[PDB]
């Protein structure tokens, strides 16, 4: 029943896709908020994922600079931001280190997918946030919540989070 608790989800790369657990990615909602499935290399399976949700975990958009998501939040609880990252471009580790921020909060400021996955597969960062009384605590970073959850990912070695299967679900990590 993941489809029930999801509040927001975006795979930067493809276009409007429902994952097999019922998780519908918002067709490229942040770059001009216009969607253009830039699959192209569907011949590079993410391995970990079944063909359709693999698309949701494989397709990438146009990396340029710090581009970020707006996840409007109006409640409190454990919001679990689990984004699936993929990278198939420049084979280098501990150099292509991306920034990953959850409402400004740099949770993964070092994201080098190639090092973490090694070969073309599905990388996942599971980021549970705890909001209480209007304050949003991510892992060990505690700050007051403001307006929405803001996932800003910043370019490291040219690329930032290349494929971005952003999935924020509500209420719990369990």
Curated annotation (Swiss-Prot):
The keyword Glycoprotein applies. GO terms for molecular function: carbohydrate binding. Residues 1-174 are lumenal. It is found in: Endoplasmic reticulum membrane. It is a single-pass type I membrane protein. Its main location: endoplasmic reticulum. Keywords: Carbohydrate metabolism, Endoplasmic reticulum, Glycoprotein, Membrane, Signal, Transmembrane, Transmembrane helix. Widely expressed throughout development including the anterior neuroectoderm and neural crest at stages 18 and 20, and the retina, hatching gland, otic vesicle, epibranchial placodes, pronephros and tail tip of later states. At stage 41, expressed in the liver, pancreas, branchial arches and proctodeum. Expressed broadly in adults in fat, intestine, gall bladder, eye, muscle, kidney, stomach, liver, heart, pancreas and lung. GO terms for biological process: protein N-linked glycosylation. A carbohydrate binds at residues 40, 62, 89-90, 159. GO terms for cellular component: endoplasmic reticulum; endoplasmic reticulum membrane; membrane. The keyword Glycoprotein applies. Carbohydrate-binding protein with a strong ligand preference for Glc2-N-glycan. May play a role in the early steps of protein N-glycosylation. Can bind di- or higher oligomers but not monomers of glucose, including maltose, maltotriose, maltotetraose, maltoheptaose, nigerose, kojibose, cellobiose and isomaltose, although based on their subcellular locations, these are unlikely to all be physiological ligands. Belongs to the malectin family. This is Malectin-A. It comes from Xenopus laevis. The lineage of its organism: Eukaryota, Metazoa, Chordata, Craniata, Vertebrata.
